[PDB]
Design a protein around this ligand. Structure first.
Ligand SMILES: [Co+2]
Ligand SMILES: [Co+2]
Ligand SMILES: [Co+2]
Ligand SMILES: [Co+2]
Lengths: 146, 146
């Protein structure tokens, strides 16, 4: 027999990407304050996460197009390896798109906030810069050609 | 002095999420064939990834709204832990949205393809089901209320 499979389009979009963070406030600062992602208030999140968001156990940030970044406070968990440069299978990096005219500002923001740059910035097609978040998860900021 | 920071909206969207996979074909089968994500052909990807995609070292899949899932072949890398149930900081899960009327079909597809369900399906607000990909990275398929 032939197994049933989903058709292209059934999975309509990426609803959210979830990250486990050891230091919730350091991560809220990184994603919300420095990177500028808008945060969802307790009354805007699913009734099932209302108290968790209220208690600061979970935080939700969104891009203007609606994609959600969920942060789950896990103070007792460890990273796969203390050194973020050590690679493994599974999640590699998460990349955000930015207006080509704001790419330089992003690089400057990373610098003024003393965030170490893992790779780049690089210019080509497009431009990109890579850096690690508080837990060692790699983030990429990139833009299309002018 | 006050550090410069990005304003809400600067990071306009999630451009792509990258995963490292030990078995490229097993992952192309999982994401493209079973989950139905549309694949980008070598002529549709950035000139910088043309040969990598051609050689099968990298694969790009997309949701209909444009978000890209990059798969990087890493046959020599290991997962953070062989048992996918072991948790760490950093990436937790990636969730895809599906029409509420197709949620049941998705659950059935997972079953017919003998993919073990980590959690769920659950019904509430919304519905959700969780399962691991070939490398042990957790995927969630969810939908809004009817
Ligand atoms: Co608001
Ligand atoms: Co990338
Ligand atoms: Co096509
Ligand atoms: Co989720």
């Amino acid at each position: 027999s032939v197994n049933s499979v989903l058709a292209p389009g059934n999975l309509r979009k990426v609803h959210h990407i979830a990250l486990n963070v050891q230091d919730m406030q350091a991560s809220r600062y990184f994603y919300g304050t420095i990177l500028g992602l808008h945060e969802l208030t307790d009354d805007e999140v699913p009734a099932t996460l209302t108290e968790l968001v209220a208690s600061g156990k979970v935080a939700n940030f969104i891009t203007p197009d609606g994609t959600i970044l969920d942060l789950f406070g896990e103070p007792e968990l460890s990273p796969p390896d203390p050194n973020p440069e050590k690679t493994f299978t599974r999640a590699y990096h998460l990349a955000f798109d930015i207006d080509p005219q704001l790419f330089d500002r992003a690089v400057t923001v990373i610098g003024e906030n003393k965030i170490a740059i893992a790779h780049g910035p690089v210019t080509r097609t497009g431009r990109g810069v890579y850096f690690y978040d508080p837990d060692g998860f790699m983030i990429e900021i990139r833009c299309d050609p002018e």
